[PDB]
Design a protein around this nucleic acid. Structure first.
Ligand SMILES: [Mg+2]
Ligand SMILES: [Mg+2]
Ligand SMILES: [Mg+2]
Ligand SMILES: [Mg+2]
Length: 210
DNA sequence: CCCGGACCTGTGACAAATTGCCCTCAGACGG
DNA sequence: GGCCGTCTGAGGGCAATTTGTCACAGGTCCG
């Protein structure tokens, strides 16, 4: 199945995208790398890749696409729009998109790589972001260990404001996304909290391959 | 001493958003 | 040649679940 690779600058960029948007983004990065910024998506191919009906695929592509307008990307800083022209459909079942050509060098560069089947069952987009960031540190054999700072997680992934209260961070983000990864990818994940005084400052992740 | 206060934790509630499902009907194609 | 039966996909919706938000109970230490 398709092998996604991407610059670490993208893995660690600041942005807010939905699951459906992130799914399309993997294919854009795949199309671009296999070579101006103009990409294409076929309804019927998307449905087969992610096990959807054509109808629900159509709904997913269409709504995702109009929600890109005005979205911006920050590399730590510098801000860019993803798209510089609205999407449009020349043929039935076919969509054409114009990626910001200044983003090309950030896609292809100190890199991250994973097969697309590893992530296609994840639902929560924050769990996608987390699985990408861990892959950046994985070893050939399939294991790794890394410490991420809590303020940096909040900025980079653009978590919502109430997760600045630590019990909500644990309950609605950390625990859920560790569960999905353990339930939906071939990885087995554990963690421990690093504290300084009363505040929790980093999260330390360990993982192996099944 | 023990207070009110400033931190921290977890949980119960509710509001807002997203999920996989369902139904309709016209477009593009073929037998 | 052209009608109609089928495969697509662009729309309209849903209830059951998940995600986002905040009040309140209940721990500690400070001055
Ligand atoms: Mg959908
Ligand atoms: Mg008393
Ligand atoms: Mg009690
Ligand atoms: Mg008290």
């Amino acid at each position: 199945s398709p092998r996604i690779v991407q610059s670490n600058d993208l893995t660690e960029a600041a942005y807010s995208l939905s699951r459906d948007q992130k799914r399309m983004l993997y294919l854009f990065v795949d199309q671009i790398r296999k070579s101006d910024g103009i990409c294409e998506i076929h309804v019927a191919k998307y449905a087969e890749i992610f096990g959807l009906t054509s109808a629900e695929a159509s709904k997913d592509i269409r709504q995702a696409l109009k929600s890109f307008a005005g979205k911006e990307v920050v590399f730590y800083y510098e801000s860019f729009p993803w798209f510089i022209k609205p999407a449009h459909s020349p043929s039935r079942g076919l969509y054409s998109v114009h990626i910001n050509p200044y983003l090309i060098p950030f896609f292809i560069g100190r890199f991250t790589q994973f097969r697309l089947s590893e992530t296609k069952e994840i639902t929560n987009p924050y769990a996608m972001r987390l699985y990408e960031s861990l892959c950046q540190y994985r070893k050939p054999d399939g294991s790794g260990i890394v410490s991420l700072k809590i303020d940096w997680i909040i900025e980079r992934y653009q978590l919502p404001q109430s997760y600045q209260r630590m019990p909500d961070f644990r309950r609605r983000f950390l625990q859920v996304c560790v569960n999905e990864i353990n339930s939906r990818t071939p990885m087995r994940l554990s963690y421990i909290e690093k504290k300084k005084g009363r505040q929790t400052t980093h999260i330390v992740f360990s993982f192996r391959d099944i």
